[PDB]
């Protein structure tokens, strides 16, 4: 009966183990996949055990976000709690026909594809008014239908773009702070945009940008709708997350090396070669040896 040597995390023997949301989307962080940054729209396989490896998930490209304005960093850790996850295949609303007059869908050089030097997250549509509609608007209301299947939870991603005084006036017809509200599952949250004086770009595509993006998700339970009320600069949802079942999550690390009987929060991958262990009674997952006082 010895205290295990700490070791790397591993694949759980009888159980699919999720490290990154999308293995095969290299050049991508989890949060890049959760947002649908271009080059990060790939298969997100099911697993029944998942390792939580980023307490503060990070983007690494696309348009600069003001992360701390919403609960957005936590999206991929929410996702990893479900057994099954997928970006929807069809857009959840038609962006161009949305309330607020005709829109062109904006794109950015911070978001290169492979067909384009210019693009945007697949979860959202940057709703830019056509040039004859650009002016202040009264709050617009759009309903976001459910669109997932079986008992899937639907996570709906949306936001709003803001800029400095002059830029706001070109893009939209209004240099005033714009207002926004989301409501879904009984949860309501209000936002008001900011004009100029933005913090430094971080975790983004690395092209200089005058503006900033704010991004949120709302949870829609099966059958249930969501509502966005909005003015100028809105990012309307498009591809949404569909999510079902449950995965056990454990704090740990990557890469997952080889296979282990058990995953231990302090000792990492742990085979049940011996029946007991001593030391730190952390949280464990799988077929595990029994903890004992030294």
């Amino acid at each position, epitope marked *: 009966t010895t*205290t295990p*040597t*700490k*070791s*790397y*995390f591993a694949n759980l023997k009888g159980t699919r183990t999720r*490290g990154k949301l999308c293995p095969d989307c*290299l*050049n*991508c*962080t989890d949060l890049d996949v959760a947002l649908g940054r271009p080059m990060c729209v790939g298969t997100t396989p099911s697993a029944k055990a998942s*390792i939580l*490896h*980023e307490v503060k998930p*990070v983007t*690494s490209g696309c348009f600069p976000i003001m992360h701390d304005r919403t609960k957005i960093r936590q999206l991929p850790n929410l996702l990893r709690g479900y057994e099954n996850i997928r970006l929807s295949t069809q857009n959840v609303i038609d962006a161009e026909k949305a309330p607020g007059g005709p829109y062109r869908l904006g794109t950015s050089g911070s978001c290169p594809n492979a067909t384009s030097k210019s693009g945007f997250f697949a979860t959202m549509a940057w709703a830019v008014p056509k040039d004859n509609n650009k002016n202040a608007t009264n709050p617009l209301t759009v309903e976001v239908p459910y669109i997932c299947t079986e008992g899937e939870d639907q996570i709906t991603v949306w936001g709003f773009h803001s800029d400095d005084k002059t830029q706001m006036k070109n893009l939209y017809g209004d240099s005033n702070p714009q207002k926004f509200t989301s409501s879904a599952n009984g949860v309501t949250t209000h936002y008001v945009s900011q004009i100029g004086s933005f913090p430094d770009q971080t*975790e983004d595509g690395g092209l200089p940008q005058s503006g900033r993006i704010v991004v949120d998700y709302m949870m829609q339970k099966p059958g249930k709708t969501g509502t966005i009320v909005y003015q100028r600069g809105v990012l309307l949802p498009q591809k949404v997350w569909c999510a079902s079942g449950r995965s056990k999550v454990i*704090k*740990g*690390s*990557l*890469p997952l*090396i080889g296979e282990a009987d058990c995953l231990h929060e302090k000792y*990492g991958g742990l085979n049940k070669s011996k029946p007991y262990y001593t030391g730190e009674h952390a949280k464990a997952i799988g077929n595990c040896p029994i903890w004992v006082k030294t």
Partner: antibody
């Protein structure tokens, strides 16, 4: 073939800073990390810190927090180490090394593999 | 003053088996994996032993890793002229929140 190639030898007055470059080849950079280790002339090895090629997460040696910064660039699969406020004790060879760990808390459960040839930094007035 | 204690010198006539010790504490060698690196003058160190007992590919079975409590040891058997180098042990230290290196032992095969 796993390769690491560093920037050229440097010489600096005390008080200035150095940025050393480390370009990576032959493996999936975004699923590994870089550590840096330095070696004063005719002495032992001192661990400096690590940075993830997946997230840019860093952890530095306690003695060098404040003075050191590590960054990395997925595009060029290159990592950089910046050391500020150089004193004569900073004269050393700077190695980078491929580190197997790329996410989770950095806690030495993994290890570092291949070492680059080494870049010498001479702090002299 | 190194956290891990390595003798500065180890030696043996060619063909003999020499050992290099490495002495630590509970926070490092006691709870963590040991690693060994070999350095020839003016070259990068190379990974020789990993996770206390393993051999990277290329490393002959002549090299052997050992660990007991808060001390580890490197054994070089069938000693040969090309093993003249410096040998460093390394482990993580939970008390100092970073990797630690032994002072390095110089291996001389006496001639």
């Amino acid at each position: 073939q796993v390769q690491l190639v560093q920037s050229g030898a440097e010489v600096k007055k005390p008080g200035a800073s150095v940025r050393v470059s480390c370009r990576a080849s032959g493996y999936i950079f975004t699923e590994s990390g870089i550590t840096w280790v330095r070696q004063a002339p005719g002495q032992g090895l001192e661990w400096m810190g690590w940075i993830s090629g997946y997230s840019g997460d860093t952890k530095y040696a306690q003695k060098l927090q404040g003075r050191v910064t590590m960054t990395k660039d997925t595009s060029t699969t290159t990592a950089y180490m910046e050391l500020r406020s150089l004193r004569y004790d900073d004269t050393a060879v700077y190695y980078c090394a491929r580190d197997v760990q790329y996410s989770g808390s950095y806690l030495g459960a993994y290890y570092f593999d291949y070492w680059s040839p080494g870049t010498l930094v001479t702090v002299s007035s | 003053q190194s956290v891990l204690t390595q003798p500065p010198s180890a030696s043996g006539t060619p063909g003999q088996r020499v050992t290099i010790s490495c002495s630590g504490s509970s926070s490092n060698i006691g709870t963590n994996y040991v690693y060994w690196y070999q350095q020839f003058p003016g070259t990068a160190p190379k990974l020789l032993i990993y996770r206390s007992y393993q051999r990277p590919s290329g490393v002959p079975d002549r090299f052997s890793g050992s660990k007991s409590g808060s001390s580890a040891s490197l054994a070089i058997s069938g000693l040969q002229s090309e093993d003249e180098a410096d040998y460093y042990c390394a482990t993580w230290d939970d008390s100092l929140d970073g990797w630690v290196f032994g002072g390095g032992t110089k291996l001389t095969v006496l001639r």
